[PDB]
């Protein structure tokens, strides 16, 4: 089915009767209000578009506001689509609570990974580190050879090299859903989801068994 | 040369 | 590592397509004294946001 947009408050255990520690990421899931529905008629596809947070009036632009205007406004943090599949929803700020996952056992979860900014090989690609010693001349964490000789006479595309790392999409998948709590807007999924505390999260029931 | 190389 | 051919006069220029400078525009006027000044900076005389701080 569809999924929702939340915010990582993040990470704490909950103990069980028979004495086991279940590490859980704590996702706050305020009601998602559908800002728009989309259809094969107004070309393309079947999807809904929700918003969830709350935003400063002086920060909401004319357009963004006018878009919120169609349907129950109260402009939120941002917008997100979910593709549909024979489920249906009318736009009058339908509002979807954490209710949705009462019966779900799965859930996938997608954040924006913490930003490492650089790394170079070793961190970025787990490259091995050259002799720390033993005569090594200024080539301790360098990447070493990066091609063959005359005959490729070039470096192939996608060569593993130093560069930007993290601060990108990444999702996690599977993740047992531990607890669902409406009128608290809580969702405890078991352990570790990408992105930093406070950052936005998209959870959907898992696509895999 | 030396000659050092060788050869 | 060194060139194998003289880079051209053209190529030089190209590289400098981005080396050019920007003016300011954000030059702004003190409400008390006349005074042009950088925004969020003290004026020549020592005014800033109307008030006179700094005697110098």
């Amino acid at each position: 089915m569809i999924g929702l947009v939340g915010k990582k408050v993040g990470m704490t255990r909950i103990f069980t009767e028979d004495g086991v520690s279940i590490p859980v990421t704590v996702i706050e899931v305020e009601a998602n209000r559908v800002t728009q529905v989309k259809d094969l008629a107004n070309d393309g596809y079947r999807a809904i578009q929700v918003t969830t947070g709350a935003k400063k009036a002086n920060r909401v632009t004319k357009p963004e506001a006018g878009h919120f205007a169609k349907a129950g406004v109260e402009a939120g943090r941002g917008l997100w689509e979910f593709r549909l599949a024979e489920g249906e929803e009318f736009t009058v700020g339908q509002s979807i609570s954490v209710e949705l996952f009462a019966d779900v056992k799965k859930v996938d979860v997608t954040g924006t990974s913490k930003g490492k900014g650089f790394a170079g090989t070793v961190k970025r690609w787990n490259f091995r580190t050259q002799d720390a010693t033993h005569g090594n001349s200024l080539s301790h964490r360098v990447p070493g050879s990066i091609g063959q000789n005359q005959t490729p006479g070039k470096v192939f595309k996608g060569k593993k090299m130093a560069g930007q790392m993290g601060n990108e999409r990444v999702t996690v998948q599977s993740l047992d859903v531990v607890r669902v709590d409406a009128e608290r807007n809580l969702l405890l999924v078991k352990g570790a989801v990408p992105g930093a505390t406070g950052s936005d999260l998209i959870v959907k029931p898992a696509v895999k068994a | 040369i030396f000659s050092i190389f060788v050869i | 590592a060194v060139q194998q051919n003289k880079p051209t006069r053209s190529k030089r220029g190209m590289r400098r397509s981005h080396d050019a400078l920007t003016a300011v525009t954000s030059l702004s006027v003190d409400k008390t004294s006349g005074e042009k000044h950088l925004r969020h900076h003290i004026t020549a005389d020592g005014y800033y946001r109307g008030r006179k701080v700094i005697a110098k």
């Binding site: 490492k116 900014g117 | - | 969020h40 900076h41 003290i42 800033y48 701080v53 700094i54």
Partner: protein, 120 residues
Amino acid sequence: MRHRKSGRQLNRNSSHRQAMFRNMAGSLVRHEIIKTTLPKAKELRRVVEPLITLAKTDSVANRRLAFARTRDNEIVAKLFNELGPRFASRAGGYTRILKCGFRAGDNAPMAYIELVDRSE
């Protein structure tokens, strides 16, 4: 890689930094105005304003602490007698940073920092 870290480095080592912001706290609490680079200025706050706060309660101890930092009896004295009570009622933010900008010799970005009630 700096995530959530705090405290500027000013291209010195811990030692140099510690002694400098000591000399400067003095130079501020003394003259009540100093000219200094904006970075150096902004950090100065996290040194000075605590001292002034500390002074708001006079005891033997609180003085002796104000001396383990700053290390100048004239300034542990000006605090407590003058600045302590002089701000005894002020929530925080005993200072303000005013920017003049761009020292000649090195194009360093510059700023004034004063005690907020300087008035004089």
